Amino acid sequence: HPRVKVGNEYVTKGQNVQQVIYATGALAKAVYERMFNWMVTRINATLETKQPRQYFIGVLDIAGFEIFDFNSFEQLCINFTNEKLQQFFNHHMFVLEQEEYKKEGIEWTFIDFGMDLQACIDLIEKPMGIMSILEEECMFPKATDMTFKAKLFDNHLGKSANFQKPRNIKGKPEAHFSLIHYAGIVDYNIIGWLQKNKDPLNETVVGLYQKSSLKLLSTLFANYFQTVSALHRENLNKLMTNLRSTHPHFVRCIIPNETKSPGVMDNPLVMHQLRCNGVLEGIRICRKGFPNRILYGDFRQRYRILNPAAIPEGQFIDSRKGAEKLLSSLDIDHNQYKFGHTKVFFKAGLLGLLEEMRDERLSRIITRIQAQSRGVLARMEYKKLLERRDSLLVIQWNIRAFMGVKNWPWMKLYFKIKPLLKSAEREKEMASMKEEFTRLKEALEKSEARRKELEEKMVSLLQEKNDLQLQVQAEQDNL
């Protein structure tokens, strides 16, 4: 008898045995899923040594592509979420890298690798995609999986290159569709998806959960349009926007063989994976293209060491013109480099050769410098070991004095009178006076410095926070 609201009063509805079973399933799912996301939020609440942050490296494992004989809502979610990560590989290596060459004005001809799947992510992500349908459909209380199947087929069949009618060769044509995610076929069973997307919970039952004696279950359900599809989507869009602010390196993990036989390596499965991961294209573009570029100021200063007569200190030198003279002086094959507006361009042969020449020229100069640094480090540390030896020596000497004194019968005068005598009255006073005045001076200056700098920084960030807050307000108005 779940309670539903009708005006200001709640009314009671009797449930069927099948629909109470389905509601108990939905309660089991939503308690599990919230318990998982809370466990993640607690992991993110540790994992924080509160240290000031300047750089991050994002490591992603956002799904395995999968075919089972039976795939459901999350088998769509997992295959899609990987799909976007491989399209990110396509965009970074072939669009982002190749556009930069033309922008810098290099005599380079753009080559089309043809590796694009943006049509299939738009097939899911777009406000006309599968996940967009499942979120717009699950609002209607009168929706059903069969009409969801009708509208889903109508919107994509003959309108998407990746959407095709299923064959159902293995039978089971009750309600099927198949989606050709990047690494191959995945067939999907539409049964139950709308309930899974909405996840409607009996409000009396969750209100009772909110009211539970178990502090976790309340914390899970405290503060119980925003479907599971939409929330996942916005997290994954945040993912790509967070990731474009990073310099990526890709890792293609390849399964060798179905049967878990180790050391066995089935050529059709691996080669098909390299085909879907577009790795051979990554070889082509790394060999043909220019894997590394350095800003003229950063490199001129960094590797001027190769020929200090080409870039003399004190004298005025243009970074572009200096770089042109220096590289002409290296006598390397002139076709292995190109000049950009703000970045120097190297082939991989020249990059590696310049890298090694820089490492060797630095090695000859800096190893001498390092030899001196090892000199000072060893000297100073072993001097500290000599000082700690000296302290050990005066420790063992005073311990010998200590035994000599307590076994000495006169100790009765020595021990008790000196704390009473003037030295404990005045030398300790001077020690405390100098300790307090030194700590006073340092603490005062450090705290004033920090406050004055940090208050103006804080107010600048808080003003920017309120400006962007007003932007969010404009967004929430439009949405």
Binding site: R53, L60, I62, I67, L216, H247, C253
Partner: protein
């Protein structure tokens, strides 16, 4: 060639360009993305270990989330069922600073339904298949998996997993991640 070379390259481009980096592990299911991720995280953990609380926590943040996240499927014995994105944060001195786990969607449907030849999530059977009777009776659940209809369907014993130890492992992963005993018990 190795994955550790890519992790070193990302740490070098980080310190040189003064820009955020990423390492984007990809493939089919069963290829090693979770283990390679555990290795990349092991890279940064042991690199900071020669030069720790966060170091360990980032490694264990995988298996604790796995045991809930993951279920033996026809395609892999240890296929995870949730997307994950990590940021590893480094300070100016290049030492490990912070980390940030963002998870995209758990396969919540699995909790009540499994096809033939696939398990429910590993936490279910490893609490049932148990070396510790107290977990078995505090839940007051039967040791036999089969009588509970929702987890029992499909397949519930696997050729390659010592669930007694995978329970021990998940217990240790929450121990190091500092989930309190009351939280760990409540979620079981």
């Amino acid at each position: 060639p190795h994955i550790f070379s890519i992790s070193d390259n990302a740490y070098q481009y980080m310190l040189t360009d003064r820009e955020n980096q990423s390492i984007l592990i990809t493939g089919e299911s069963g290829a090693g993305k979770t283990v390679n991720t555990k290795r990349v995280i092991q890279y940064f953990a042991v690199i900071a270990a020669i030069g720790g609380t966060l170091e360990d926590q980032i490694i264990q943040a995988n298996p604790a989330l796995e045991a809930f996240g993951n279920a033996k499927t026809v395609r892999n014995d240890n296929s995870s069922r949730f997307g994950k994105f990590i940021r590893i944060h480094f300070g100016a001195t290049g030492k490990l600073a912070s980390a940030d786990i963002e998870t995209y969607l758990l396969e919540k449907s699995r909790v009540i339904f499994q096809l033939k030849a696939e398990r429910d999530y590993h936490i279910f059977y490893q609490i049932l298949s148990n070396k510790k009777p107290e977990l078995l009776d505090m839940l007051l659940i039967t040791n036999n998996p089969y009588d509970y209809a929702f987890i029992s369907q499909g397949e519930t014993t696997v050729a390659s997993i010592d669930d007694a130890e995978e329970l021990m492992a998940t217990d240790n992963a929450f121990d190091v991640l500092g989930f309190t005993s009351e939280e760990k018990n409540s979620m079981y």
